[PDB]
RNA sequence: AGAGGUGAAAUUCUUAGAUUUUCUGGAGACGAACAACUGCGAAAGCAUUUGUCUAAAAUACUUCCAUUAAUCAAGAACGAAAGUUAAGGGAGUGAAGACGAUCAGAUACCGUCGUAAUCUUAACCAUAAACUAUGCCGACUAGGUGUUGGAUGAAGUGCUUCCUUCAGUACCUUAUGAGAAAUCAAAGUCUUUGGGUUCU
RNA sequence: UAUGUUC
């Protein structure tokens, strides 16, 4: 774990079968359109995959079609300018700062906000080392509330 | 050289334990370290029981008990004989 | 002797060959005769195809399903 | 006919108060304590002092008219001590042997749900 | 560049009066001369006009507040108790 | 003293003995009418002595002298509490105790504060050493007991609330309502106190005395 | 979680649909009847809020009292200026209609 | 007519009614019993109810990204108690101090009283035997008894227990493992000496 | 659970 203690090995393990499940006679001719419609209706790719697994019964979009969900979203041009995890971290930091402004006596909240901003800086450094984020992206803490956009 | 494995108290996964006060001397002692004795005693001895039950009414009177629950520091417990010094090998045994 | 091990079902996830414990099932409500796909350990609420009814309640585990009906694995 | 009073017994490692009042707790009938039955400036808490303290109040109650008594046992206070002093034993004993009837018995020592700081420092009494 | 290390706005007093007195007056002059949030227009533009009067530059609306701040903790708490009911 | 005269004490109609005790005051050397001294006197008397049954020996009722005629005081319900020895007896290590309190008003505008206590159960097939309940379960139990107390004290008058205090009809209801969430052993209304009472109505006091 | 959902729907409409913020634009839009929903900040001056409400009642357009002031409404819309008044000429793929 | 207090006393309160009994109102602090070799937190620490805000962890996942990570000089946040500053509070306790005792002396231990402090708010201070005297991350090595939080499967009566497992958290035994030993399931896998890293 | 030095 990045901060604190606890190994917490809870996760999801993909099946050995890499290919599309045999019982799925469904055709991949419209699964990408389904995810595109879902993203248009407004869903982050994580919950797009979750909704696809639950309500559509088509696990491992990568197995159904040899291309992964955020990748097809980018290929269609729908993908957001800020990656999902970084945006969620920014939202958490914005909420925490909004709370702290009212309660400056919340030392624990201040500490965890420092931790969250450290994570934000590390992951933004990674994303701008890749070309997934503009080189001038900084995350100043003043206008992050509207930076979600 | 670390007389006891537990350090003389029962603190684990914990930073601080609020202290209580010795019933005998009033010393501050951590709650996990204090020697606790829950005394459920008779209000009187057997002879006084035999006196006041027959001097009482309802013909079935049962005397109430006294629930004390004292706590002592190490020095007071040792002096009042609630705990013994014990031998090194016997020091491990609790019950 | 860890190569031909066989009774590792009770072994925790990520055993010698990591395989998920979840699966997919087809559900049929009595008197409704409908076909739909469902995920064990589902996290959302699902509705039937023929007649809109409740099927499973998303909990921390394998859901609760309904009192009756027939649910069968989709494994081949 | 049976007429009832309430004897508050106060045993606090010093003089044993024996305080008979009426049922309401006001209009006290007699209050003897243990400091008048002994004149050694000590033994105020003694079983012997409590014994005479109790038979004196028993005689006064006999002459006053009340014949049955409800015990209200009390030990020091919320901050000082929780156990009754040596005099409670003999107070109850002598009240029983005096011939006046005894009804219900209750401990009413003030028990602090709070924890106001008790005397002596964090190192306690060193004697 | 940075002009005074620590005296800030109290640099106007030079060396006169005690350092403790100057620090005490700095603490309260900082909030006496600050702009506050005008809850009627949402623009942080209400400044002190006289000792207890605070006027918004945009609304031109003025409220009764503290001597050195727009609100005081005692008044805020009293309003909180009143608005609880 | 010689200038003190006995007075009789009466109990409300819903109790059994109806005469529990005698009180004494001073004579009326008139600046004090020697009746205002008696008025507003609280008498703490056991339910066992008020109902002639040993089963209720753990509850004591407070009766407040409210009206005096001739030589007998009449009194009225002023509060109740369970005894210290029983309270300590029903507290043991290895169980979690749940306490709750609520403020209610009867149909007679009798403002009461009631404190109830409860403990968890071992049940039969536990084969464990502790019966601790989770904090969420404790919160649910406390909310349930507060709601039950407020409902069963608000729907009725004061006299019938006192009457139902005797069989501990509220502890049984809390038991049967919390059975389905977490089993509870002996749970009772530990204490009831009167926060405020309406203006004295001698008419109502007498129709409840008769 | 009472303002978060409406903020998310606002995010969706700013992304997808077309809108207009400002008193004059909203008044004109729902004068011509192109307004599907109007959002009023809690900070809106009383007279102008009443004007908006009367106009929308006339035009059969819904009004939503935003929980924040014009400052929070601006950030919710993603702008760096106070809004205090929103009109949505058409909803994108957002469920702000129900 | 004594009450406090003590080893015994005395200082102290007390016919103007002390102590004691009962009731009413106010005040400040505290939150017993439950309460544990139990829980949470980076540590300091955190225990009356309820509400709101806020975060964390484990578990479950055929959800997403795909190396984004480990440890870290400088640098930064927090940091018991005491102490400092300014308002408030001020019951109880009580560094100083004043008495009464004890003693050869007693400026101490004991007793009576008592200022600062303790509490709240806003700032400083940055220290503790701040201790499991044991840096953090990773792999491997053994049986049992528990216990906390989830998840899995089955069974006495819609409801309770047992099985498996994950993550905590202790304890017992065992070492042809270690160690100077006390002891240690890590303080082991080290002259058969090298997984990574910081500090001393 | 009075006090009780030094070699």
Q: What is the CA radius of gyration of chain G?
A: 12
Tell me the C-alpha to C-alpha distance, in Å, between residue G50 and each of A87, E42, E61, F100, G30: 38, 19, 20, 48, 14
Superfamily of structural domain A80-149: S15/NS1, RNA-binding (1.10.287.10)
A128 touches strand H (CB under 7 A): no
Sole residue written with tokens 């019950």: B95
Residues 6+ apart with CB under 8 A from F38: F7, F23, F25, F65, F68, F73
Q: What is the bridge-based pairing of β-strands F184-196 and F111-120?
A: antiparallel
Measured CA G9 to C1' H140 distance, in angstroms = 53
Give contacts of F83 with chain D, Cβ < 8 Å. 106
Give residue A148's Cα distance to chain centre.
13
Chain H nucleotides near the protein (CB, 7 A): 1-10, 19-23, 28-51, 53-70, 76-79, 85, 91-95, 109-112, 121-123, 132-134, 137-138, 146-153, 156, 160-173, 181-184, 187
DSSP C3: S
Asked if G43 lies within 8 A of E40 by C-beta distance, the reply is: yes
Give residue F55's Cα distance to chain centre.
15
Asked if F109 and F179 touch (Cβ cutoff 8 Å), the reply is no
Q: Residue B26, Cβ neighbours under 10 Å: how many?
A: 21
Asked if B64 lies within 8 A of F85 by C-beta distance, the reply is: yes
Nearest residue to B65 (alpha-carbon basis) of E31, F90, E4, A50? F90
Can you give the residue range of the structural domain that contains D75?
Answer: 1-127
For chain A, give every residue range classified as CATH 1.10.287.10: 80-149
Q: Give the total residue count for chain A.
A: 149
Instruction: Dig out the tokens for D31 from the structure.
Output: 């209050």
- Domain C1-76, CATH: 2.20.25.100
Q: Residue A140, Cβ neighbours under 10 Å: how many?
A: 7
Phi, psi of D12 (to 5 degrees): -140, 40
Nearest residue to A32 (alpha-carbon basis) of A90, A80, A78? A78
Residue spans of alpha helices (H) in chain G: 3-15, 23-31, 46-59, 70-77
Instruction: Dig out the tokens for A69 from the structure.
Output: 């969900």
Phi, psi of A50 (to 5 degrees): -65, -45
Q: F158-165 vs F169-178: helix axis angle to the nearest 10? A: 70
- DSSP code per residue over F129-166: S-B---HHHHHHHHHHHHHHHHHHHHSS-HHHHHHHHT
Phi, psi of F52 (to 5 degrees): 55, 45
Q: What is the CA radius of gyration of chain D?
A: 16
- DSSP code per residue over E16-80: -S-HHHHHHHHHHHHHHSS-B--TTT--S-EEEEETTEEEETTT--EEE--SSSS--HHHHHHHH
- Whole-angstrom distance, CA of residue G17 vs CA of residue G32: 18
Is D25 exposed, middle or buried, given 0-12, 13-18 or 19+ CB atoms closer than 10 A?
middle
Sheet arrangement for strand D28-31: D28-31, D17-21, D4-10, D68-74, D101-107
- Whole-angstrom distance, CA of residue F159 vs CA of residue F77: 9
Q: What is the bridge-based pairing of β-strands F97-105 and F42-46?
A: unpaired
CA angle D110, D116, D118 (to 5 degrees): 90
* Minimal CA separation from A27 to chain C, in Å: 15
Q: Which residues pair with G64 in a beta bridge?
A: G39
Which of G15, G79, G93 faces A146 most closely, judged by CB atoms? G79
Tell me the C-alpha to C-alpha distance, in Å, between residue G11 and each of A41, A87, F97, G38, G70: 12, 14, 49, 15, 16
Instruction: Dig out the tokens for E1 from the structure.
Output: 């560049």
User: Would you list the domain boundaries of chain F?
Assistant: 3-210
Q: Residue E63, Cβ neighbours under 10 Å: how many?
A: 17
B22 touches strand I (CB under 7 A): no
Is E3 exposed, middle or buried, given 0-12, 13-18 or 19+ CB atoms closer than 10 A?
exposed
Is F189 exposed, middle or buried, given 0-12, 13-18 or 19+ CB atoms closer than 10 A?
buried
Residues 6+ apart with CB under 8 A from B6: none
Q: What is the bridge-based pairing of β-strands E53-56 and D68-74?
A: unpaired
Nearest residue to F90 (alpha-carbon basis) of F188, F172, F5? F188
Is F177 exposed, middle or buried, given 0-12, 13-18 or 19+ CB atoms closer than 10 A?
middle
CB-based touch B/A (3+ pairs, under 8 A): no
Tell me, letter by letter, the H, E, C secondary structure of chain A: CCCCCCCCCCCCCCCCCCCCCCCCCCCCCCHHHHHHHHHHHCCCHHHHHHHHHHHCCCCCHHHHCCCCHHHHHHHHCCCCCCCHHHHHHHHHHHHHHHHHHHCCCCHHHHHHHHHHHHHHHHHHHHHHHCCCCCCCCCCCCCCHHHHCC
A9 touches strand H (CB under 7 A): yes
- Torsion sign across C-alpha atoms F140, F141, F146, F149: positive
Which CATH number is D121's domain given?
Answer: 3.30.420.80
- Whole-angstrom distance, CA of residue D27 vs CA of residue F87: 30
Measured CA A50 to C1' H199 distance, in angstroms = 46
Phi, psi of G75 (to 5 degrees): -65, -35
- Asked how this structure was determined, the answer is cryo-EM
Tell me the C-alpha to C-alpha distance, in Å, between residue G59 and each of C8, F181, G35, G63, G95: 69, 53, 8, 11, 21
Q: What is the CA radius of gyration of chain C?
A: 16
- Whole-angstrom distance, CA of residue C16 vs CA of residue A126: 34
Q: What is the bridge-based pairing of β-strands D17-21 and D28-31?
A: antiparallel
Please name the helix (run of DSSP H) or strand (run of DSSP E) that holds residue F80, with its range, or none: strand F77-82
- Whole-angstrom distance, CA of residue F160 vs CA of residue D80: 42
3-state DSSP assignment of residue D59: helix
Inform me whether the C-beta atom of residue E42 falls under 8 Å from chain G C-beta atoms.
Answer: yes
Instruction: Dig out the tokens for A117 from the structure.
Output: 């901003």
- Whole-angstrom distance, CA of residue F161 vs CA of residue F155: 9
Asked if E40 and E56 touch (Cβ cutoff 8 Å), the reply is yes
Measured CA C62 to C1' H151 distance, in angstroms = 9
User: Would you list the domain boundaries of chain B?
Assistant: 1-95
Q: Residue F135, Cβ neighbours under 10 Å: how many?
A: 9
Half-sphere exposure of E20 (CA within 13 A, CB side): 0
A75 touches strand H (CB under 7 A): no
Per 3-state DSSP, chain F is made up of helix, strand and coil in percentages (nearest 5) of 30, 35, 40
Sole residue written with tokens 């007699």: D30
Measured CA D18 to C1' H43 distance, in angstroms = 55
State how many domains chain D has.
1
The b-or-e profile of F30-50 (16+ CB within 10 A means b, else e) is eeeebeebbeebebbbbbbbb
Tell me the C-alpha to C-alpha distance, in Å, between residue F5 and each of A48, F22, F30, F194: 90, 10, 16, 30
Asked if D3 and D76 touch (Cβ cutoff 8 Å), the reply is no
Domain B1-95 has CATH 3.30.1740.20: yes
- Whole-angstrom distance, CA of residue G94 vs CA of residue G91: 6
């Amino acid at each position: 774990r990045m901060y604190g203690k606890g190994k917490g090995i809870s996760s999801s393990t993909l099946p050995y079968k890499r290919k599309q499940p045999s019982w799925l006679k469904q055709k991949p001719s419209e699964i990408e359109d389904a995810i595109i419609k879902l993203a248009k209706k407004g869903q982050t790719p994580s919950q797009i995959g979750a909704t696809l697994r639950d309500n559509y019964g088509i696990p491992q979009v990568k197995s159904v079609t040899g291309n992964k969900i955020l990748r097809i979203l980018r290929a269609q041009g729908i993908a957001t300018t800020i990656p999902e995890d970084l945006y969620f971290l920014i939202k958490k930091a914005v909420s925490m700062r909004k709370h702290l402004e009212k309660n400056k006596k919340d030392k624990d909240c201040k500490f965890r906000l420092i931790l969250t901003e450290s994570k934000i800086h590390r992951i933004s450094r990674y994303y701008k080392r890749k070309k997934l984020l503009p080189s001038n992206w900084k995350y100043q803490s003043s206008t992050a509330s509207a930076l979600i956009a | 050289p670390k007389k006891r494995r537990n350090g003389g108290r029962s603190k684990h996964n914990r930073g601080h334990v609020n202290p209580l006060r010795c019933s005998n001397c009033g010393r501050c002692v951590p709650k996990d370290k204090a020697i606790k004795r829950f005394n459920i005693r008779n209000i009187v001895d057997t002879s006084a029981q035999r006196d006041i039950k027959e001097a009482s009414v309802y013909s079935t009177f049962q005397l109430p008990k006294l629930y004390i629950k004292q706590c002592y520091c190490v020095s007071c417990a040792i002096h009042s004989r609630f705990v013994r010094v014990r031998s090194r090998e016997q020091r491990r045994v609790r019950k | 002797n860890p190569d031909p091990v066989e009774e590792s079902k009770k072994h925790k996830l990520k055993r010698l060959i990591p395989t998920p414990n979840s699966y997919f099932m087809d559900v049929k409500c009595p008197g409704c005769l409908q076909i739909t796909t469902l995920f064990s350990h589902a996290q959302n609420v699902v509705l039937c195809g023929s007649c809109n009814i409740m099927l499973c309640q998303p909990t921390g585990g394998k859901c609760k399903l309904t009192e009756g009906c027939s649910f069968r694995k989709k494994i081949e | 006919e049976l007429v009832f009073g309430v004897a508050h017994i106060f045993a606090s490692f010093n003089d044993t108060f024996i305080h008979v009042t009426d049922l309401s707790g006001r209009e006290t009938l007699v209050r003897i304590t243990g400091g008048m039955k002994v004149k050694a400036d000590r033994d105020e808490s003694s079983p012997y002092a409590a014994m005479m303290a109790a038979q004196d109040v028993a005689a006064r109650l006999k002459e006053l008219g009340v014949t049955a008594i409800h015990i209200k046992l009390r030990a020091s206070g919320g901050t000082k001590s929780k156990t009754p002093g040596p005099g409670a034993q003999s107070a109850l004993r002598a009240l029983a042997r005096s011939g006046l009837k005894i009804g219900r018995i209750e401990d009413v020592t003030p028990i602090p749900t709070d924890s106001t700081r008790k005397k002596s420092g964090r190192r306690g009494r060193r004697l | 560049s940075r002009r005074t290390k620590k005296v800030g706005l109290t640099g106007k007093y030079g060396t006169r009066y005690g350092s403790s007195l100057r620090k005490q007056i700095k603490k309260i002059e900082l909030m006496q001369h600050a702009k506050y949030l005008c809850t009627f227009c949402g623009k942080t533009a209400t400044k002190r006009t006289c000792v207890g009067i605070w006027k918004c530059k945009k609304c031109k609306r003025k409220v009764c507040g503290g001597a050195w701040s727009l609100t005081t903790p005692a008044a805020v708490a009293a309003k909180s108790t009143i608005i609880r009911l | 003293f010689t200038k003190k005269e006995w007075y009789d004490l009466k109990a409300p109609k819903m109790f059994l003995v109806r005469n529990f005790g005698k009180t004494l005051v001073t004579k009326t050397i008139g600046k004090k009418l020697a009746t205002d001294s008696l008025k507003g006197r609280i008498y703490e008397v056991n339910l066992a002595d008020l109902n002639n049954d040993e089963d209720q020996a753990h509850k004591k009722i407070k009766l407040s002298c409210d009206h005096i005629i001739n030589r007998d005081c009449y009194t009225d319900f002023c509060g109740l509490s369970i005894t210290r020895d029983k309270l300590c007896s029903l507290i043991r290590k290895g169980y979690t105790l749940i306490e709750g309190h609520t403020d209610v008003k009867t149909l007679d505008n009798y403002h009461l504060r009631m404190f109830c206590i409860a403990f968890t159960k071992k049940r039969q097939n536990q084969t464990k050493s502790t019966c601790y309940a989770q904090t969420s379960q404790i919160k649910k139990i406390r909310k349930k007991m507060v709601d039950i107390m407020t409902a069963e004290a608000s729907k009725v008058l004061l006299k019938d609330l006192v009457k139902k205090f005797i069989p501990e009809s509220i502890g049984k209801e809390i038991e049967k309502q919390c059975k389905k969430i977490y089993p509870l052993q002996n749970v009772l209304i530990r204490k009831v106190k009167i926060l405020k009472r309406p203006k004295l109505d001698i008419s109502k006091l007498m129709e409840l005395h008769t | 979680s009472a303002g978060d959902n409406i903020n998310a729907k606002l995010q969706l409409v700013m992304k997808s649909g077309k809108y207009q913020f400002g008193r004059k634009s909203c008044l004109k839009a729902l004068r011509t009847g192109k307004g599907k929903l109007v959002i009023v900040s809690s900070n809106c001056p009383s007279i102008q809020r009443s004007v908006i409400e009367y106009y929308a009642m006339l035009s059969k357009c819904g009004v939503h009292d935003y929980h924040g002031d014009n400052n929070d409404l601006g950030t919710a819309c993603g702008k760096l200026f106070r809004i205090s008044c929103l009109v949505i000429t058409d909803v994108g793929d957002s469920d702000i209609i129900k």
